[PDB]
Design goal:
Protein name: histidine kinase
Largest sheet: 5 strands, antiparallel
Number of strands: 5
Keywords: PAS-fold, Kinase, Phosphoprotein, Transferase, Two-component regulatory system
Entry title: PAS domain of histidine kinase ThkA (TM1359)
Number of helices: 3
Strand order of the largest sheet: 2-1-5-4-3
Assembly: monomeric
PDB class: transferase
């Protein structure tokens, strides 16, 4: 698969969780939206890397991140709000 997207706010809260993420992880968007990613068993490490990426204001690409039975590419991208210019969170994109 490709393009499982989890977007986190600057407080670590899930603000986006697309249908690919639903299919990959078996959790519905409505069941995770608003929650801290790091509170989800199995996502603690990904949540920690996103925190580090946010603090350093630089994107990070990881390959061969093992999750379940497969290896994945994971990109972490900090972003700003265009209107306020504030750092507003991190987009996480997971691909086979």
């Amino acid at each position: 698969m490709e393009t499982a997207i989890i977007t986190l706010s600057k407080d670590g809260r899930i603000t986006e969780w697309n249908k690919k993420a639903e299919q990959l992880f078996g959790l519905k968007k409505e069941n995770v939206l608003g929650r801290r990613l790091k509170d989800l068993p199995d996502f603690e490490e990904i949540g920690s890397v996103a925190e580090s990426v946010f603090e350093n204001k630089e994107p990070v690409f990881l390959n061969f991140y093992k999750f379940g039975e497969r290896y994945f590419n994971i990109r972490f991208s900090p972003f700003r709000n265009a209107k306020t210019q504030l750092l507003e969170g991190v987009i996480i994109t997971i691909d086979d």
